[PDB]
Amino acid sequence: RLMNNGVGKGKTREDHKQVSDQLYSAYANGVDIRKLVAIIGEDALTENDRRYLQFADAFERFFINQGQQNRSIEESLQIAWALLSMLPQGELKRISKDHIGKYY
Amino acid sequence: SQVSPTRMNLLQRRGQLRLAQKGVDLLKKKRDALVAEFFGLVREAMEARKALDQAAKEAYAALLLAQAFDGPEVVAGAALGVPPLEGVEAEVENVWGSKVPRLKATFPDGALLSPVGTPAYTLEASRAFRRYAEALIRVANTETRLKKIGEEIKKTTRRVNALEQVVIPGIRAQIRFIQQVLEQREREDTFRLKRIKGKIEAREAEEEGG
């Protein structure tokens, strides 16, 4: 429920609230593709999918696991950004460019 | 929008599962056959094709002792040996979605029988059509088969999946939905009946003792 609370400047970094939502739909439309592959024909699906495809993997077996080991909101968010990079900046429509120029 | 009915339908939707479950049991191995038969054709296709395709040019391109610039003369000169450019015997054959038609034309193409004496190299060079053309007809009926068998294969397995991870687990959930819903109703039974007892006896120990 809560989340658009306790986020933003002076409490945490100010790009947090934003970088949520991007990811959300991104990952979303990844698996979404993977469904339809198995129906008509895998490579009969839109070519500008294959990246969004691979993007689902990264968040997948690259990120989620982290075994046992202490983590930090800092170290987290750092690699939270890592996620975005591969997909263009011109495809990130739920975040402003200032934080993009904060990092990439 | 609606849920189901409420009873008996349990049994019917069970025979829904029977229909599905068993149906899809066999639904693969319908296709097992066709995939089986498929390999032979995959093998067969290019064999003669590659061989005489290369042997068409063999002399053809390589006998231009006149034939290239007097190719003009000869090529004119011996042109249209038998060019109907037709032969269609249209064939229909089992293919899903429409039994697609295939066909063969069947007429010559030239090779040592062509009109007039004329030079010698010519006729043999003309012979080459047997080995591009005639032979190339083989792929005209085999190469289409690959795609046709594709259609089936694909479409079929397409359903396998769907059935297997859409239909079945949903209708699975149908069965449940009934089940429990029947059950909680059955509480009421118990409770109502429950109350009846308390009364019948509570009432009666007062007549002979009070």
Check A41 against B161: CB less than 8 A apart. Answer: no
Check B161 against A40: CB less than 8 A apart. Answer: no
Using an 8 Å Cβ cutoff, are B42 and B142 in contact?
no
Give the chain B residue whose CA is nearest to the CA of A40: B158
Measuring CA to CA, which residue among B30, B29, B37, B31 is closest to residue B145?
A: B37
Per-window interface: A 24-83 vs B, CB < 8 A: 38-41
Residue B89 phi, psi dihedral angles, 5° rounding: -105, 95
Whole-angstrom distance, CA of residue B81 vs CA of residue A97? 73
Whole-angstrom distance, CA of residue B197 vs CA of residue B194? 6
- Select from B151, B153, B154, B167 the residue whose CB has the most chain A CBs within 10 Å, as the one to mutate to test that interface: B154
Q: How many interchain CB pairs under 8 A, A with B?
A: 6
Final resolution, Å: 5.0
Check A38 against B161: CB less than 8 A apart. Answer: yes
Check B154 against A39: CB less than 8 A apart. Answer: no
The 3 state secondary structure assigned to B66-88 is CCCCCHHHHHHHCCCCCCCCCCC
Residue B91 phi, psi dihedral angles, 5° rounding: -120, 140
Q: How was this structure determined?
A: cryo-EM
Give me the torsion for CA of B182, B187, B189, B191, rounded to 10°: -170
Partners of B80 in beta bridges: none
In 10 A of CB B187, how many CB atoms?
9
Q: Crossing angle, helix B47-60 and helix B133-162, to 10 degrees? A: 150
Measuring CA to CA, which residue among A31, A46, A26 is closest to residue A88?
A: A26
Check A39 against B162: CB less than 8 A apart. Answer: yes
Q: Crossing angle, helix A73-84 and helix A16-40, to 10 degrees? A: 40
Chain B interface with A: residues with Cβ < 8 Å: 154, 158, 161-162
Using an 8 Å Cβ cutoff, are B109 and B134 in contact?
yes
Measuring CA to CA, which residue among B81, B88, B172 is closest to residue B122?
A: B81
C-alpha separations of A21 from A11, A98, A104, B97 in Å: 19, 16, 17, 44
